[PDB]
Design a protein around this ligand. Structure first.
Ligand SMILES: CCCCCCCNC(=O)OC[C@@H]1O[C@H](OC)[C@H](O)[C@@H](O)[C@H]1O
Lengths: 12, 268
């Protein structure tokens, strides 16, 4: 079951 | 030396690759701001281009639902982007605490987000990194405005002309066309709006996997559903707008303008 989580931004 | 003369630094609000965000006070005016502080010592000329792009894009955008840039200040070793102080915290944290929004609250919320996106698109700006952490509430007082922030990954586009502009964004919110490494433009932002509206209504995302390669497969295939019990009482008009935003084919994906005319937003 999918949890809401903070995620890192990428530039490559 | 305008920043060192006029402003005092207080606590950290966020972090970046070469940067920090801190509350500051313009001392004589008695007014508080959020400063992005970039260390510019031996920055690459490309990274200088990116910094000037963020400042330029931020100066272009004048909208109630977008964080205002007040000043861009170049000192020796440090650059300062001085933005409005927003004290309501990330939309992310509000969604986790309330768990989910009512349809009327989610609609009012996504309506503001789409108006900000519409403005961006009309000014030839693509954000590329919409998500709940990048959307800030204007105050802690319930009913506070949502403000779009962090244009660090934003690009300038010429009308409806698309290209491979590079791989940038956040995994859960990435568009199929970015993951395929195909040309893209404004629609990447409407895909991310679809992901956010889904989170707004049930408080968990439509795409998640421990395995990032499996995550990207799920996204590229538009493999989302509306599980029980959380979707049991959600209207089909809400499912419909999400469907239209989470359309794989970016030409057939609903635009910001079209989304603001969707009955689920406009007929209340
Ligand atoms: C990142 C470059 C844009 C800075 C704009 C700051 C707007 N004013 C602003 O006062 O930002 C608020 C904080 O700033 C960060 O998010 C932007 C924190 O992650 C959040 O916790 C948020 O509460």
């Amino acid at each position: 079951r999918n949890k809401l989580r903070r995620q890192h931004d990428y530039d490559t | 030396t305008r920043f060192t003369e006029e402003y005092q630094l207080f606590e950290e609000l966020g972090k970046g690759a070469f940067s920090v965000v801190r509350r500051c006070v313009k001392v004589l005016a008695g007014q508080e701001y959020a400063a992005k502080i970039i260390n510019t010592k031996k920055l690459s000329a490309r990274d200088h281009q990116k910094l000037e792009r963020e400042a330029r894009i931020c100066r272009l955008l004048k909208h109630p639902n977008i964080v205002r840039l007040h000043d861009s200040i170049s000192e020796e070793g440090h650059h300062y982007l001085i933005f409005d102080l927003v004290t309501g915290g990330e939309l992310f944290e509000d969604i986790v605490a309330r768990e989910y929004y009512s349809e009327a609250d989610a609609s009012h919320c996504i309506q503001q987000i789409l108006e900000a996106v519409l403005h961006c698109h009309q000014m030839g700006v693509v954000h590329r990194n919409l998500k709940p952490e990048n959307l800030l509430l204007a105050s802690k007082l319930k009913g506070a405005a949502v403000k779009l922030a962090d244009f660090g990954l934003a690009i300038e586009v010429e009308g409806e002309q698309q290209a491979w502009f590079g791989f940038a964004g956040t995994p859960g919110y990435l568009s199929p066309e970015v993951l395929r490494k195909d040309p893209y433009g404004k629609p990447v932002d409407l895909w991310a709006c679809g992901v956010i509206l889904y989170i707004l209504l049930v408080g968990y995302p439509p795409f998640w996997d421990e395995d990032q390669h499996r995550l990207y497969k799920q996204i590229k295939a538009g493999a989302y559903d509306f599980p029980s019990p959380e979707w049991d009482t959600v209207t089909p008009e809400a499912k419909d707008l999400i469907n239209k935003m989470l359309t794989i084919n970016p030409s057939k994906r609903i635009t910001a303008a079209e989304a603001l005319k969707h009955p689920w937003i406009s007929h209340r």
